[PDB]
């Protein structure tokens, strides 16, 4: 069963830091790595995510990849730094120059072996290795270029494990680098063929939700990450606790992807509320469904209603009646009936774990697979062409040995992918 994390890049590293913060807490593991959790129930699966080093330290099995040494020295100095094993840190040395080509050839191309190794040293640890999580960001250096190179090696090494990817897709209307379309497109092409689950988080949609749904003054990058990290825990770990209907990753995936061109989901979390108005009653389930199916609770910026959904999968986690669950689901399919592709009979794939996530009385992740996500690759595709046309920064790529024709490819390719997505919209 066990499974193996990978944090590439600055974002991808940062998030990591909250994520192991989360998980750890959900098994009551100290920062030192010694267990002090609440109930035995915990401990039983830990395995999934840890390794025991010597009856005390449970060390996370992760890999931390980055070319800029300043990175790693912030994470190991964090509140949960102690918990790794130093080997796990694989830095580069060079800068992560924001150039996909510099990542995906050249510099990253050097560093690869010093990763690939470690992944085998880790794989041959135990059990049946389920898969890899890869978190990383499409904007930075190491992420789109180099990290997209990485997978292609993993997917040659174990061409049968799953690959979850959390990409921090760049929010086209709230920019932060001027190469964005180069860094996005060059990777997406590679991505769409080698990974089994991609979870797109539009960075500002993430903003929004914190400033408007939860309502905080100041959304640090730190916050956001914190919120995200609940969702990728909200998928998996969760199922690694006994429930009423345990169905994870494999199941999960194979409930979702009808055609084989991968498809990307859009995560949505659920009992998320302002601090003050947390006070007003709820938590019974219709609110959770209330949440989830709203556009302002998508962590991805396309708003569903401009698409339909193809499959949707709610992984709940508390104590409750399956009838009031199954029931909701139904209603939802009738109230928003035009938002569903028809030739799927029943869309929702309910799964229901048990254990609650710490302070909450019960929570519930949503993973929706909508055609609304066409409207993301459009944006990207636009930006690209518009500047490809004038070859704007092109030389920094060209100069590393990338032809232009790759630039055609990726574009072509990726544009056609938008195409697909509509064909099964209407």
């Amino acid at each position: 069963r066990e499974i193996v994390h990978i944090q590439a890049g600055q974002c991808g590293n940062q998030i990591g830091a909250k994520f192991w913060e989360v998980i750890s807490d959900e098994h009551g593991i100290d920062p030192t790595g010694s267990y002090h959790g609440d109930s035995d129930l915990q401990l039983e699966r830990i395995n999934v995510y840890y390794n025991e080093a010597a009856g005390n330290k449970y060390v996370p099995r992760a890999i931390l990849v980055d070319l800029e040494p300043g990175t790693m020295d912030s994470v190991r100095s964090g509140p949960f730094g102690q918990i790794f094993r130093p080997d796990n840190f694989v830095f580069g040395q060079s800068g992560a120059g924001n150039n996909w080509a510099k990542g995906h050839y050249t510099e990253g191309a050097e560093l690869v072996d010093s990763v690939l190794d470690v992944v085998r040293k880790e794989s041959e640890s135990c059990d049946c290795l389920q898969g890899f999580q890869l978190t990383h960001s499409l904007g930075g250096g190491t992420g789109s270029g180099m990290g997209t190179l990485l997978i292609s090696k993993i997917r040659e090494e174990y061409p049968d494990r799953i690959m979850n990817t959390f990409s921090v897709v760049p929010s086209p209307k709230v920019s932060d680098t001027v190469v964005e379309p180069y860094n996005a497109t060059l990777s997406v092409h590679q991505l769409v063929e080698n990974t089994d689950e991609t979870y797109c988080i539009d960075n500002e949609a993430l903003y929004d939700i914190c400033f408007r749904t939860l309502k905080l003054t100041t959304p640090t990058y730190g916050d956001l990450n914190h919120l995200v990290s609940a969702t990728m825990s909200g998928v998996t770990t969760c199922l690694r606790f006994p429930g009423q209907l345990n169905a994870d990753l494999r199941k999960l995936a194979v409930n979702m992807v009808p055609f084989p061109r991968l498809h990307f989901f859009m995560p949505g979390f659920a009992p998320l509320t302002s601090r003050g108005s947390q006070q007003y009653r709820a938590l019974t389930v219709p609110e959770l469904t209330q949440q989830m199916f709203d556009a302002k609770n998508m962590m991805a910026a396309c708003d569903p209603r401009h698409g339909r959904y193809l499959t949707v999968a709610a992984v709940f986690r508390g104590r409750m009646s399956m009838k009031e669950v199954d029931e909701q689901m139904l209603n939802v399919q009738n109230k928003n009936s035009s938002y569903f592709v028809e030739w799927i009979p029943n869309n929702v794939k309910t799964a229901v774990c048990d254990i609650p996530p710490r302070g909450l009385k019960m929570s519930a992740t949503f993973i929706g697979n909508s055609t609304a996500i066409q409207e993301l690759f459009k944006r990207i595709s636009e930006q690209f062409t518009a500047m490809f046309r004038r070859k704007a920064f092109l030389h920094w790529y060209t100069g590393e040995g990338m032809d232009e024709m790759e630039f055609t490819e990726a574009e072509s390719n990726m544009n056609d992918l938008v195409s697909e997505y509509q064909q099964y919209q209407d």
Binding site: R1, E44, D127, C128, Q130, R240, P242, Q244, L245, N246, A247, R250, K251, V254, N255, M256, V257, P258, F259, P260, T311, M320, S321, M322, K323, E324, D326, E327, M329, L330, W343, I344, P345, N346, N347, V348, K349, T350, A351
Partner: protein
């Protein structure tokens, strides 16, 4: 004497787990007396783990809780071929150390579901391997079939149409029940708003007791498994009766204890207690086996059946003159403390074969079709060893099972 039991799947173990309690409780088995007689198989550890852990640890002798470590999944193909293959052996072996142990057993209660991954796949080839080693025993399966509206999967139709054609030709007798139709009862005739897979399981846990446990209690007019198959097929096709159990009444809202044979018996025929979302009110019955248990004196019974026989709104297929085997076992129903049901003194587990189930296949056939028309999730199956044959040809089969249940009405 006894008759072994097989729980397969994410689901199936849960059912077992309830039931096996009740079952034991009924004989008053100490939570430490003579060891159970069954097995539990499933590939994803997590379910079985509970049973190695929760109360009822002692109760089984480990060997018989077989588990995979590998990814079960949720899709026939895999479950049939690929993964499941590995396990089969180990399993078969156990049932032969347990088959050879017992003397003069009778058959296999399978609990498999078309939900969980394995439930379909596995079972399919398990039942195959059974049919060869024990070609003559009895193979009665309680399956959980997927409701019309509520569903919790999207491979649902696929996952059950692949199981059907094979199970037809390996099984003797299939009970069907479905979740959706069970909840209803829990609201209406039992009045709770908390159903969980753990409540419904307590329920099925009753219907099953009416076969074994109680039969293992002598009374006025005991019945037998062959007796079933005999009285319930009506042609040689592994036919699909539907089950119903009847004095389901909420304790405390049962001071209404002026409650008799006549009522509980009449209380079966209403489609309100249908037990699967098919209303037989426009089907034809064709053979019913009313098993009673508790204080029942034959006559009443044999009168209450007359009344039914004369209620007219029920139809009954022509060419059966009489179709009511009657079972009386003695032993009052027993009630689990965690349960809801009320400690009645007589109950009726009537089962019966009806041309109505034409319904139930249709809604499910339909589903399948749509999707197959797009070739929807096909690559998940293909890529596991399944063939496109197995698809087209498992439709066609079930088509011609829909023809039998159609034909078998209107014979004159």
């Amino acid at each position: 004497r006894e008759c072994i039991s097989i729980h397969v799947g994410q689901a199936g173990v849960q059912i077992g787990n309830a039931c096996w309690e009740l079952y034991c409780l009924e004989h008053g088995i100490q939570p430490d007396g003579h060891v159970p007689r069954a097995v539990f198989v499933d590939l994803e550890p997590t379910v079985i783990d509970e049973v190695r852990t929760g109360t009822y640890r002692q109760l089984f002798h480990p060997e018989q809780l077989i588990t995979g470590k590998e990814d079960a999944a949720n899709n026939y193909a895999r479950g049939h071929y690929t993964i499941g293959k590995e396990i089969i052996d180990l399993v078969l072996d156990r049932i032969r150390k347990l088959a050879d142990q017992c003397t003069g057993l009778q058959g296999f209660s399978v609990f498999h579901s078309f939900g969980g991954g394995t439930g379909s796949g596995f079972t399919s080839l398990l039942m195959e391997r059974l049919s060869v080693d024990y070609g003559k025993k009895s193979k009665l399966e309680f399956s959980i079939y997927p409701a019309p509206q509520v569903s919790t999967a999207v491979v649902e139709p696929y996952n059950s149409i692949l199981t059907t054609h094979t199970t037809l030709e390996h099984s003797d007798c299939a009970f069907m029940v479905d979740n959706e139709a069970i909840y209803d009862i829990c609201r209406r005739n039992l009045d709770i708003e908390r159903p969980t897979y753990t409540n419904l399981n307590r329920l099925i846990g009753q219907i099953v007791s009416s076969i074994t446990a109680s039969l293992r209690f002598d009374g006025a007019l005991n019945v037998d498994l062959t007796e079933f198959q005999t009285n319930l097929v009506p042609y040689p096709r592994g036919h699909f009766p539907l089950a119903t159990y009847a004095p389901v009444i909420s304790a405390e809202k049962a001071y209404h204890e002026q409650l008799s044979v006549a009522e509980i018996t009449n209380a079966c025929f209403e489609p309100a207690n249908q037990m699967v979302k098919c209303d037989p009110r426009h089907g034809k019955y064709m053979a019913c086996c009313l098993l009673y248990r508790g204080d029942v004196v034959p006559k009443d019974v044999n009168a209450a059946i007359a009344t039914i026989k004369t209620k007219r709104t029920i139809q009954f297929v022509d060419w059966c003159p009489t179709g009511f085997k009657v079972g009386i076992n003695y032993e009052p129903p027993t009630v689990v403390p965690g349960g809801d049901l009320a400690k009645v003194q007589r109950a009726v587990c009537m089962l019966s074969n009806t041309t109505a189930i034409a319904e139930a296949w249709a809604r499910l056939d339909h589903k399948f079709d749509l999707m197959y028309a797009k070739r929807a999730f096909v690559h998940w199956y293909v890529g596991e060893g399944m063939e496109e044959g197995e698809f087209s040809e498992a439709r066609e089969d079930m088509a011609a099972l829909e023809k039998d249940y159609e034909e078998v009405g209107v014979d004159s």
